[PDB]
Amino acid sequence: GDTSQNALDWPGVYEGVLPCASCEGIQTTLTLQADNSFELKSIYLGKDESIFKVAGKFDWDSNGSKITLSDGSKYLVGENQLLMLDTEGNRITGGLAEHYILKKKGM
Amino acid sequence: LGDTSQNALDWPGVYEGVLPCASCEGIQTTLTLQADNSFELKSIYLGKDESIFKVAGKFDWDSNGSKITLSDGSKYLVGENQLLMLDTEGNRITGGLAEHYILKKKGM
Amino acid sequence: GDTSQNALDWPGVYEGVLPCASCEGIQTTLTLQADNSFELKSIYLGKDESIFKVAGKFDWDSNGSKITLSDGSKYLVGENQLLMLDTEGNRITGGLAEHYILKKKGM
Amino acid sequence: LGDTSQNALDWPGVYEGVLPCASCEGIQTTLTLQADNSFELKSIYLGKDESIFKVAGKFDWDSNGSKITLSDGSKYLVGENQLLMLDTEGNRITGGLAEHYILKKKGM
């Protein structure tokens, strides 16, 4: 039971501008609820703004540490943040590693 | 005849860079363009879970002879000794990572 | 001047369920205005529904026949329909060719 | 030990099918899985503008030993003499084109 899922005040809204494969950035808002539902809004930055929204349920891993959303995206749940992981749940390395953090709103 | 980049530039060749990756460290990219408007793309998705993509196809130029669209839908502005990846609208990508979208000709 | 752009009552709302690479289908609504603006809504069908929206300007080709949206997608404008084309503006062939038609709403 | 498809099936092998394509005729697909959880994918995007993709990488199984996720994010349900492509939620794809998501083992 000594998990992040139990330890952290994780329900809430997280925001960041994530790297985009073919655009300025993905202005991301990810809202998590205590009932393991979520709302993801992804704004692909550019002259037209293009907005992807998905709402659904997410799952916790067996360690109560990482979540997987219904769009397949994974996050490490941390103190005042979510860290988006690679397709297979590993931390994203390299020069842009910090760009994958979604900070709890107001921080 | 058209006073265009397509006609002005020695654009057939090999271009390389490391592009931003939506969910990985980066995309080590090698894009080879031929005069007959065929291309070959290699993309190594870097990180703890590496993969390699290789794409071959044809590309097309816009009416202005400036921008190319690859068969995978990616667009590039063809420039002097470089390609600049554009967004889906065909616009130059602005912001913090703008320079990360440049593929320079090999040996530069 | 003898073009589809001049001939057709093309402004309006077009709908269809397009093939999806990794889902049931893309329930698509594409609204075109006379001023060459558009609104595209794409619902990726499944248990969570995921919705992509983009609004912007579109361009006509020199023949006044095919349009290109700000997300890069292309359409042949026809009588009471739009026909989505491949990346390079060619008609999509094969067994599923008719699945790429967006019919004007009410038809 | 786990009573799972991963342990039950002779799943290493080559699977083929023609998948639906978002903006082309179809995707003639060949997916090769190895016992060490590495894969090779060939995808020919059919139509008037043909292109060929080749992807190599690793894949991972879910805890139930039933579903695999490739390094490109695609998921499949591993079954008897077939793979079934799943949606991004990992659910079986329903509707009019449901059977088009099956890749059968080669020679079937």
* Among candidate residues D107, D23, B7, A57, the one with its CA nearest the CA of residue C91: D23
B47 Cβ under 8 Å from any chain D Cβ: no
| Separation between Cα atoms, residue A13 and residue C30, nearest integer Å | 31
Q: How far apart are CA D100 and CA C22, in angstroms?
A: 11
B98 in Cβ contact with B77 (< 8 Å): no
Residue A4 phi/psi, 5-degree rounding, is -60, -35
Which residue of A62, A72, A87 is in closest CB contact with D63? A62
Instruction: Calculate the alpha carbon distances from C88 to B7, B35, C2, D22, D89 in Å.
Output: 21, 18, 24, 14, 31
Q: What is the resolution of this structure in A?
A: 1.4
Domains of chain B and any CATH numbers: 1-107 (2.40.128.640)
Least Cα distance to B43 among D56, D69, A85, D24 occurs for D56
What is the C-alpha separation between D38 and D12, in angstroms, rounded?
10
CB B26 within 8 A of CB B46: yes
Number of A to B CB contacts under 8 A, please give it: 80
Closest to C29 (Cα-Cα) out of C86, C84, C102: C102
Contact D89 A56 (CB under 8 A): yes
Of the candidates C23, C91, C94, the beta carbon closest to that of D87 is on C23
Angle at B59 between CA B55 and CA B63, to 5 degrees: 160
Best A45, A48, A71, A73 member to test C by mutation, with max C CBs in 10 Å, is: A48
Do residues B78 and B6 lie in contact, with contact meaning Cβ atoms separated by under 8 Å?
A: yes
Cβ density class C17-47: b for 16+ within 10 Å, e for less: bbbbbbbbbbbbbbbbeeeeebebbbbbbbe
Question: Is B87 within 8 Å of chain C by CB?
Answer: no
Per-residue CA distances from C97 to A28, C43, C94, D23 (Å) = 36, 20, 5, 10
C30, C104 in Cβ contact below 8 A? Answer: no
Token pair of A21, please?
């494969």
d(CA C14, CA C27): 11
Residue of C56, C62, C88 lying closest to B69 (CB–CB): C88
Contact present, A25 and A18 (Cβ < 8 Å):
yes
**Tokens standing for C85?**
């084309």
Whole-angstrom CA distances from C23 to A86, D75, D87, D90 are: 21, 11, 5, 10
Q: Choose, out of D21, D40, D55, the residue to mutate when testing the contact with B (most B CBs < 10 Å).
A: D55
Closest in D24, D85, D91 to C92, CB measured: D24
Q: Does C23 touch chain D (CB under 8 A)?
A: yes
Interface check B71 vs D, CB under 8 A? yes
